[PDB]
Design a protein around this ligand. Sequence first.
Ligand SMILES: [Cl-]
Length: 384
Amino acid sequence: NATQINEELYRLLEDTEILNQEITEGLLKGFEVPDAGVAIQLSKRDVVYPARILIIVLSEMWRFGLTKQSESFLAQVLTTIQKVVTQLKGNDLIPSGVFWLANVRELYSFVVFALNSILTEEMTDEEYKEYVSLVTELKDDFEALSYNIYNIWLKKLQKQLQKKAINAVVISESLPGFSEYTMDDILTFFNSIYWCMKSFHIENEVFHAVVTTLLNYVDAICFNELIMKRNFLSWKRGLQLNYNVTRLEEWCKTHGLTDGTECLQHLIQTAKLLQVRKYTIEDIDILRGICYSLTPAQLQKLISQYQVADYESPIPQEILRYVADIVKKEAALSSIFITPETGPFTDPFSLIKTRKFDQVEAYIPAWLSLPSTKRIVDLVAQQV
Ligand SMILES: [Cl-]
């Protein structure tokens, strides 16, 4: 009976005390991410199950005109999701962050869809006014949420790289003995971003933005460490740096990026500088063309700090003064560090068309224990 289903639905939805607690503590804070990787085939419903559940609840509240209940519910949802992303850390950081990006994108896409449906197809006409106004604000709130959690997450990713990439790129020996975190750890990290985004059906533009931002970041912070080191830069260190950096560049090539080489140019060009001949004037003129991303002052620091090995010819004084003169020259034509980009960053989701919404069957997973929420979804499902 439609009326009995409607009455029961109505009482479930007006009882926001019980419902908000279920949603915020059980569904949102209690989220479980599905597995990601090469042999994994996830349906979209396994990835965005929290968003789809929220969408069912939300729309039922609107259908019954529980506009005040929806506002209460939504404020809790917005706060909780942002809070959840703020608390992400450790091994879970990449999959949980991508998970929440997917879900907030699904929510935002729904609201965009609902707003267009309201304006196009659709009890006081002044209540309708307040309604359009509510959904419009909700669209802005989810846009802000997406931006916020994208930036919160991306900053946490940068810090994990500040922690690992410097040791892996600059310090760890690709050739042990030649001269904690290794390039393998760095590759694992970027692979995890790749496979979580792939498996969780994330739009490729977003993958491009995230990884380009992080590669530029690795480039800046590792370069800055390298250029301060005064008893370290040498041919051997250059060969090892080459092997570390090339591995990251080759990963970029097989994982959809064509601009990875451009993001790593300061590291790549430093490795070259550390390896090529630095003995004649022409050597230096050639080196300048190879190192087109390095300033003369940077060339000078790197060259003047270069450490010759036993049986290796010293860099001649003639060449050191040539370089110093190129620096004093270009100075007379009016930092050595690269400023790391720390944001905030444009939300790459905001640049692409939203998910066109096809109405999907009411579904709520099995490990969940959400009595009211599950009854709502079951009752909605019965009306179909
Ligand atoms: Cl992973």
